Symmetry: C2
Subunit: 82 residues, 2 copies
């Protein structure tokens, strides 16, 4: 019992543009809203004007923050962090 | 000759588990070694028994390094600044 049960996705906020790979395969990080304003962090490769599809994965804020803190102290080791 | 149609995948480095969703849907980030030497970053969701499609997106070293720098410099702001 819902009025028109269909999902609408749109790019809410542009976070990071990683790189465009292969042939028209753009891969970036932004927040996509699905019906309303539940814009979560979506890390996905987007298909070109022709065919194929990206293996992009969606993360919630909790999950997203988790990886960020880890990599914050781990991968970026060029600054002062023991 | 060797039948080069078998890309041997082995996870030599488990970065961190993000969250375990529902009950069997584990979502984490790890490095998968394809053939052996090329072990790059992969963000994949794993399913319970039988296992089903959980997306799973592979990122290259450069693209991964990119996001870590940016996310290290931000995002960590508490969702109640104003």
């Amino acid at each position: 019992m819902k009025k028109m049960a269909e999902f609408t996705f749109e790019i809410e906020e542009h976070l990071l543009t990683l790189s465009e790979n292969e042939k028209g395969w753009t891969k970036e990080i932004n927040r996509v809203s699905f019906n309303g304003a539940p814009a979560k962090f979506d890390i996905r490769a987007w298909s070109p004007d022709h065919t194929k599809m990206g293996k992009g994965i969606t993360l919630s804020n909790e999950e997203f923050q988790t990886m960020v803190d880890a990599f914050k102290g781990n991968l970026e080791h060029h600054h002062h962090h023991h």
